[PDB]
Amino acid sequence: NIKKEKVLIPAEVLIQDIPLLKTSFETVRKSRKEIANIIHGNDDRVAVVVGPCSIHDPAAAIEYATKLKEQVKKFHKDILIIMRVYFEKPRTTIGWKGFINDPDLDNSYNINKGLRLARNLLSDLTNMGLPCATEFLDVITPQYFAELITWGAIGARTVESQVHRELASGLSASIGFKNATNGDVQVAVDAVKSATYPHHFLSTTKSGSTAIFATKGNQNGHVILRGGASGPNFSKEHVDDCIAKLKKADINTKVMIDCSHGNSQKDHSKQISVLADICEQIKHSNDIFGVMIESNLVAGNQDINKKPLTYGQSVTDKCVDFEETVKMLEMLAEAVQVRRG
Amino acid sequence: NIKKEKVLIPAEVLIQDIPLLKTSFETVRKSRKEIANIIHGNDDRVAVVVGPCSIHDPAAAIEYATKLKEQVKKFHKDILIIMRVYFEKPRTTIGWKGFINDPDLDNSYNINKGLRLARNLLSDLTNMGLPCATEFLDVITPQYFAELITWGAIGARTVESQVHRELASGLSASIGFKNATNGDVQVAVDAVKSATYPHHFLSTTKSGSTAIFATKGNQNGHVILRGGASGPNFSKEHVDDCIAKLKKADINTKVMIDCSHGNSQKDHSKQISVLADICEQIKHSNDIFGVMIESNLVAGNQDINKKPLTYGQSVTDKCVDFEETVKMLEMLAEAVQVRRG
Ligand SMILES: [Ca+2]
Ligand SMILES: [Ca+2]
Ligand SMILES: [Mn+2]
Ligand SMILES: [Mn+2]
């Protein structure tokens, strides 16, 4: 059932072509220490992973990033802003997989081009001084850009996946694990726990070879609450339960809450009301360390097959516009100010 | 968080060392056609995937196989027997991963040895004329033995995993997809559906390189019902629902039922009573095509750290002994005889 084996250019080559720049190196090094301390509760700033549902237009991503970088100096005493740079969209069965799989959006499937532009985008963003977030999807793609990532995620669909826990245990970035699509938080706690251990597993090298990897474990793992079939899990009730589950596993990292996806129930205009509940919580407890917001230049979404596409509007999930995103940052920064004694 | 990159020997080399023998080739070719026809309903024999929970002793596996091969001629008009040769055990967080990860059972993690003995075991079994089943776990291990596999599985924990659906879409073996650990059958139906499509995805070659794979899709995918947090799903009620879900996705393959794991609720002495319900169903409907039984030489299980280990007894999940397995085959063969007009 194999039509064709096609050539893949190893990460080595793209790393030579698109080197780790000094500003990038320093942004990652610094922001990684900063998010680790927030995750463990040693800083009471709140982390905000904010950006487009998925990248389809790198030029639009740069323009978005410019606007975001402008806000950082307003909020940096209260908030750590990390830009969401996602290259894959989950699909129930089929559909556009994302920018890495098909960057030209035309079923040409130019994965080499995808990987090249993905890395180049991450190089550009971090070189502007913006920390970046992405989902770690498999054992091949991360070698192309994992050293440009400050914070990463394991998705709801792979939270029970053994190689994903193993993979996370070897990544340098801090890692959040989403609860299951059905709403189960225990499996995400299990995943965090597993990821703290050393593992031997099969992965790939920068030279494009297969290899055995012995990992050290990742002590900066935490749960992301993102709703599911059980219903939204952003409330105080749900956060306390998650914390209780973590303590049972002897894990002391804090909780991140996704304002979007299952918690907003896919409604982009609900993100701000989920955030309002989270801010009230942030004021009276240090249990929540972070949130995720799905945000873009133009609000809402469109069909990927529309000609011409609206510039700066999501081609996947509905996002809030930037104006609304600034209000949300204001809300979070106030939450932190009131939190502080 | 990487302690060490260690060398992995590419499948190429193990394939040269442990070649596909002629009897093996013919067993796989024939048995694959046979299971495909059963899955699609064109044969009304029932497929039986039967064997140890997981392999830890290849010599004990050969002895088991000999006994199994002896039964085939008794039952082959009614039943297609496929031997279960599993090399991995799911763990909530940590524990012995299985024979590939750590064949010497001592945290030496000699994965190359594991892969070598795994392939050599599969070569031996198929060379005896026994079709074999295994779980397809990742994008690296299958290159070492996928051409010796008649029927494969995607586990409950990876049923929502995108690369696993993609992987299945490129494998030649027939593939069953387990329902989710929570009990959700829809996700397994979704996975079967997705696996019928062509995909472009990142995988690995026999030379041990990374590559893009364009697949054709796999039209021999089906659901495996195996219980979960929802409770056992072996009953008629549950089988009808699964069939209804499949028809909605325009998938016409039939249903396999695991007598063990979630359906027996981990109790090995319940497998036979779950099977009794399934046989009654098999008599009056062609919806169920297959079952899974966890079986070994000695009944029950033991701790992997016992010195000395009991020969022929499971080191993971509890299995029924062979005597009881023969009774179960008798029951299934009778079920089919009554089914037939
Ligand atoms: Ca402790
Ligand atoms: Ca049709
Ligand atoms: Mn999204
Ligand atoms: Mn088992």
Numbering used by the authors:
A (entry chain A), B (entry chain A): 14 to 354
Article excerpt on this structure:
Francisella tularensis, the causative agent of tularemia, is classified by the Centers for Disease Control and Prevention (CDC) as a category A select agent, and its role as a biological weapon is known to have been investigated in the United States, the former Soviet Union, and Japan. Here, we demonstrate how a combined computational and experimental approach based on metabolic network modeling, ligand- and structure-based drug design, physiological modeling, and whole bacterial cell-based assays successfully identified novel antimicrobial compounds in a highly abbreviated time period. Third, we carried out homology modeling and X-ray crystallography to determine the structures of the selected drug targets for subsequent ligand docking. methods, three proteins [3-deoxy-d-arabino-heptulosonate-7-phosphate synthase (aroG), nicotinate-nucleotide pyrophosphorylase (nadC), and d-sedoheptulose 7-phosphate isomerase (lpcA)] were readily crystallized, and their structure was determined using molecular replacement.
We constructed and expressed full-length or slightly shortened recombinant proteins for the remaining targets to optimize protein crystallization without removing any functionally important regions. All structures were prepared as full atomistic models for use in target evaluation and ligand docking. Given computational and experimental limitations on the number of targets and compounds we could screen, we selected a diverse set of 10 candidate targets across a range of metabolic pathways. Our selected targets, as shown in Table 2, included the three enzymes we were able to crystallize (aroG, nadC, and lpcA), four protein homology model structures [shikimate kinase (aroK), pantetheine-phosphate adenylyltransferase (coaD), chorismate synthase (aroC), and 6,7-dimethyl-8-ribityllumazine synthase (ribH)], and three existing PDB crystal structures [enoyl-(acyl carrier protein) reductase (fabI), NAD synthetase (nadE), and 2-amino-4-hydroxy-6-hydroxymethyldihydropteridine pyrophosphokinase (folK)]. The success of generating crystal structures against some of these targets was greatly helped by the availability of genomic DNA, express primer service, and robotics to clone, express, and purify the proteins and to screen crystallization conditions. We mitigated these risks by considering multiple (ten) targets. This proved important because only inhibitors for roughly half the metabolic targets (four) affected bacterial growth in vivo.
